[PDB]
Amino acid sequence: LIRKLPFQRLVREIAQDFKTDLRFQSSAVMALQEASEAYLVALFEDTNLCAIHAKRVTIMPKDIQLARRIRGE
Amino acid sequence: DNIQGITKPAIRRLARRGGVKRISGLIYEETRGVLKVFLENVIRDAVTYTEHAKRKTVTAMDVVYALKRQGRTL
Amino acid sequence: VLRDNIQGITKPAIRRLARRGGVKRISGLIYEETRGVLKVFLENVIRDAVTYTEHAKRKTVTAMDVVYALKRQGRTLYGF
Amino acid sequence: NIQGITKPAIRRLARRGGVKRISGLIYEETRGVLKVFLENVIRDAVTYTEHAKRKTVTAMDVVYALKRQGRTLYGFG
Amino acid sequence: DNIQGITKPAIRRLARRGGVKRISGLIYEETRGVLKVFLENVIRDAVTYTEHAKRKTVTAMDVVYALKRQGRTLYGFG
Amino acid sequence: KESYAIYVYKVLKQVHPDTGISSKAMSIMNSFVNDVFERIAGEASRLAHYNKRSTITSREIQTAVRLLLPGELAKHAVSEGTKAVTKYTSA
Amino acid sequence: ESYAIYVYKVLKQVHPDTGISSKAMSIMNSFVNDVFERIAGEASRLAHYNKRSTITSREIQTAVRLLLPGELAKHAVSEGTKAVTKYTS
Amino acid sequence: ESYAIYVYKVLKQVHPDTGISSKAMSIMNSFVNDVFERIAGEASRLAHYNKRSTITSREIQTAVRLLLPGELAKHAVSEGTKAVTKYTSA
Amino acid sequence: HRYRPGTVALREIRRYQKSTELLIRKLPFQRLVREIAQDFKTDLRFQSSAVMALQEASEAYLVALFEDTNLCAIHAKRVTIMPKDIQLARRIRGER
Amino acid sequence: HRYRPGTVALREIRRYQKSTELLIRKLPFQRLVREIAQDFKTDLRFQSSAVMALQEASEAYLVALFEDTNLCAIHAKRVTIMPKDIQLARRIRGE
Amino acid sequence: HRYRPGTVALREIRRYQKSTELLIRKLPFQRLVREIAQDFKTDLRFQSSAVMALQEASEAYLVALFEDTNLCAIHAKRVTIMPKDIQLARRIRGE
Amino acid sequence: KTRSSRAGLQFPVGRVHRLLRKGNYAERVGAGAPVYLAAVLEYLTAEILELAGNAARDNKKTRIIPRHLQLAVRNDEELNKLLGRVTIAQGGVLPNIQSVLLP
Amino acid sequence: KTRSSRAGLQFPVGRVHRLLRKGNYAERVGAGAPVYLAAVLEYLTAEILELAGNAARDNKKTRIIPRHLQLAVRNDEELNKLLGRVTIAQGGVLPNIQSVLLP
Amino acid sequence: AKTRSSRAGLQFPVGRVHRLLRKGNYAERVGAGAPVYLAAVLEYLTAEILELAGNAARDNKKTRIIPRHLQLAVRNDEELNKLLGRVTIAQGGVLPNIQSVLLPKKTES
DNA sequence: ACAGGATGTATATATCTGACACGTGCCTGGAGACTAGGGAGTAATCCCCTTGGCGGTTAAAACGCGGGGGACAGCGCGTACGTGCGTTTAAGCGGTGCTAGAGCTGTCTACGACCAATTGAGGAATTCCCTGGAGACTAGGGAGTAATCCCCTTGGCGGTTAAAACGCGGGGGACAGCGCGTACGTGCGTTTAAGCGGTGCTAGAGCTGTCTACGACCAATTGAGCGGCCTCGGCACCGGGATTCTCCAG
């Protein structure tokens, strides 16, 4: 659902903090992508609940960070 | 730089898949923040599994071991 | 034992719990809700503690059985 | 007669077979199964004795009957 | 590999001809293991006859001699 | 080359003169006849050897049939065998 | 006649200090005669299947591969071939 | 079976005048038992994942780098390395 | 005179946050846990330390729940806690 | 409209006991036979009638084993067959 | 003193599985053998070793049967062997 | 003239004698052995073909089919006793369902 | 002399070796494993006791009590991340109320 | 003269085996190698039996092989057990074995 | 519990195709006759084993009783298995094509059988000696079964004090309604980069073989840690006074 190459580049740019000339299996990046999208969808569900609780349909960052706090992130 | 590779329509799709009706313009940056730390918390552990193998390639097994650890701490 | 000792978790005590929880005022429907969530919290821990007592084939639930029940529930209690 | 195969003997055979507990109907069932086994073996041992134009049944006729029945006995030639 | 080509439906058909009404889901692998053990016991014997014939082709008669040696005789194949 | 088919067919046209038989069923009957032949001849061989005598006679065949066949199927098989031998030798 | 003196000579090879009861020796006679009947009857059956008139060592070899379990077979065939190649030496 | 004497021996050097209550001592016993068993758990998981029969310092070091947060890890692996190299040099 | 409503609430919060005692009466809770357990094993027995451990875990759980529900109430721009806040906190915690 | 659980089972028991077809697909079974033979001899050939003879003996064996398994299931008061029933039946059959 | 039910049964199992002697009395069995033979041919004699070969084969068959019926009892989740266990064992053997 | 007609048999006494002598069953074969054996083979053939023709007629077929040979052998308990360890290619099974499984 | 004093540790290396043996964590335990693990346990013990003793002194008490352990663990953000799922018996709560409730 | 057994290196009698192959009417002809091969196989199987039976005797602290020890040998070696699956050793007993369901013991951990 | 509707199977008819049945020709096998040898049969005698009886003693079986444990029935709950539907996949059928291996024929040589003679091995019998196992007795250990004792917690009781329970008034909070401005969505056009395919290269992953070092196991000895007891200090509680915070009135 995210584009494949931009996410792969982001995974390279994060990983190069922890090790250098690190290599990735083609399916390791895909496992990261699908775990990330599943995590974000579940977070947007908790956000939409927090928005609805404020009598409000538009989600706002205070809703994301409430959901994250209540989840204990 | 590259976190802007996670584009506004892609986040909008992820939110509409989550059932969100309307999204304020501040959410995209906030989403990029929470995604960025999530990847950091997973990839870092994956790289400690690879280093323990003395490997130079991160495998899908290392990713799923990292994910099952993060999910256990999550 | 009496049928309804959940009413022994009294409204003032729930109010004190809410004070340590940092709550300035509470609607009167909170007390029954809290007795609900307390009952459903307790009974699953009691079940796991009994499971450990029966695995050890013992007459008594010990504090270690409670601690293991909580630990497997994902909440760790230090001091017992 | 078949009552010569007493309850204690069948108990001992069941103990040798590893049976811990025995219902009281097992004894008649075992006497029936034994009698059917013996009939099936003795009929062949006597057929071998008749063919030999002989009238003592030998251990070798028993071994041949058992071999035919598909269960081979070692120790009697 | 090809043992998976003995599908769940075919084992259900075989069990139904056997008069079986309900079939636990663990039976299929148990059945495949039982069939693989049976076939290899017969084919080992059948190919022993082909090697004794110094043939390259397993014939139906080698199979029949293997089965009857296994104690179970098949009528219909000469 | 070697088949009993015409004799099984003669018996069929004797016991059920209107019925036919498929070639798969005929090959089953041929396998049956060869199996029973091999059983009887093998038992008569073993029985002749057991008595340390060189020859298979009608008596070995009779006793082999009495061992192999059950019950009244044996009683009829031996009555047909002995009837056939009597009609043969009296000829 | 019986195999008892040969069973005894192989016992003295395998366990020189051990003895054997006459009732165990008769079981060993029954065992040898049974295994002989099995092998020879399969060699004859197999010779007949191939329209051969002769029991050769090859028929015995395939008879023991049919009759003996695979690990017993593997050693039995090597003892057989070692004996034949010594005999024909 | 208690760590209490060791918790005292650490206390008397980190705060030489301070004491500790037995209700806090049993909390310290609980803490060190929990951290011991979770470090050993992750070392076991790492050994199994790498198909290794043996748990060594190389396993515990990475179990510490997994379980502990970054600067607690950085100090922990330093104390561990120093203690091991002292033990092997002695 | 009257203290203004909510000031004595803040005072009560301050004293129950600065103090570590158990807030539920012990004997009513012991009766509760014996009632709950008697449904699972008729003649069961407890160590007193087991009842104490259950109380400590229960109170810690309820306190942290009330914290998350106060967060939910504050998020809706109101100060009274209402059951829909407990229901939201627990649903977001996934602990239904 | 749905038939009750077991109504269609009894119907197809009656069907497959009335017929005489082979029930395993022929090409899957043939490929299995060749895969098993490959472990015994390389470049081996089969007569088609050797594959059919193997399939006939295999299916008659499996049907008979399922009958003994069903007797075992009935003995334990069950109606579902379970792997322990096949294992018992094959134990008592001495195999 | 009294041992509890099953303690002596297990001591008996260990006793009889350790030993090898024949467990039926000899004369009762010899009379049974003679009565069974009297229906096939009158005034048969028997070698004593023929009666022993019959006794050995009969006891080996009964023991091997009881092992299977014990397995069938255990499969029915009970420790008492029942006639229906003998009947199942014999049916699965195909006797 | 031929020995089968002398014995009154359809089955070939001469071929049975040949197969006995080329079979290594024994070093000699008596003259009554192939007659007795052919008469037993003929009896058992007629017994099976009779039961198979009954089964065929009950199924309204005019021809014996392996299904009918299986129905014949398995319904007669003495043929089933003789042929217990035998399977008939393209024969089925006897219809039977346990009363515990029936409704 | 004990392996602890060889390694320079107060915590018992020998006991940690036993407890690694008896936990079946793996079938073999290397000699350096209990020295590394005992040194990490001593480190984390000294760190938490430092924080708890400071909290006790700030309370003007000579003696550490569960309250001071809770205050130490929750005021250090990093021990707080290590001990996030942990409840401390009679530890109480870290004093906090937000300015939305205050007047 | 030298016996064919000693020419082949065998203890079992190659001449007797050859005679029995002819006398038993197994085929019209018996090639010269069939007796040697069959004698070698029978000797091997006999040595395997008597090795295992001698071990069973020694473990019982007995000096003499008896039918019990042959039964223990055959039934403990699964290859001999499946060769001798349809065979009974007269005056042999059974392997001591009891199903765990029959035993009273528990773990109670 | 009963009635009606739907689904599946069986029966009937027609047509087409494949298999069975019959006839003919040729080759092989069986039948008939004669000769020779041995195997089978019969008769007689002798020896051994089986059958029957008698007597006594001991062990096993039978017979009865009490209690415990297992088998059987009943009930409830949860998950797995069955039935239905849609979509996808592979089997089956038909046709082509090629090659390997099966099957047959002919020729030649070696192997096996048969015969005769000779020699050795094995079997049988007898005697003697030694060893192994069995039987009995004695002692110890281990398991099975039951009781004792000791300690911990529930239960009961009394009384006092604190907490909660209840009622009321006021004030603050919650909820609703309304208005307006901004921001999110939507539409369109243009641009850009993702996606896909292909090509080339290397370095990391995986695996296999070998050898040494490390760790486990076993045994012995010593020191440390735990358990129990004692003493002193620290903290908590109580009482009083002062200070600080909050509320109302000018």
Added chain:
DNA sequence: CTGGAGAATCCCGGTGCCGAGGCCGCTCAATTGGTCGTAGACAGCTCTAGCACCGCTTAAACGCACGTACGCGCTGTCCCCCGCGTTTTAACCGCCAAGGGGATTACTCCCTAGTCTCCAGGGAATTCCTCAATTGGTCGTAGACAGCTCTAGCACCGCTTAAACGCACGTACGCGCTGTCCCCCGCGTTTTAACCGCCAAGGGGATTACTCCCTAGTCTCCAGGCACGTGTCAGATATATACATCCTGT
């Protein structure tokens, strides 16, 4: 907004009690030393897979404009929560008794080990006899080895069609728990038959010898069986209609 009053809290000092800390002795675990076997490390090889680069296409993203919807702020009203006072009830503490469990101990029975003695039986030796095994020669057939031809096996492709796979949902069956009653086990006592053991007699099997009949081998001739081709008939397949059974609703 400011000042004063009242309530609450904090601080200081003294006293008491319990826990913390230290000391001593003993036991168990830690350490030390040796041995052994395997795991891991090291080395080398192979080859997949990851990384890099290029080009093209098109979908997606981006930018801007437009317009309305939603968020937020304001205002008003009503409801319900709080705080305080008084009353009521239960928590808490101390004390005492009994049961329940847990562990320990005792007692009895059975099994195993050691020792001693006796029996048998097995093994070894020797001698004699008979039959089988070996050796050598001859002769005939079977099998091997080669050549040749044809069939069947294997591969490929194209297609349709029905079967298989995936998923959804609901109910039934399996599994577990509980209670009760009957039957089997353990044991004691009494009775009966089995087993040891010997003696006697007769029958049946074995062995030997002789004779006759039966089967095998060989040769020749004739008929039957097998193979192939053709014609006919029954079975199979398809479609339609009726009947039976099961499922669902009242």
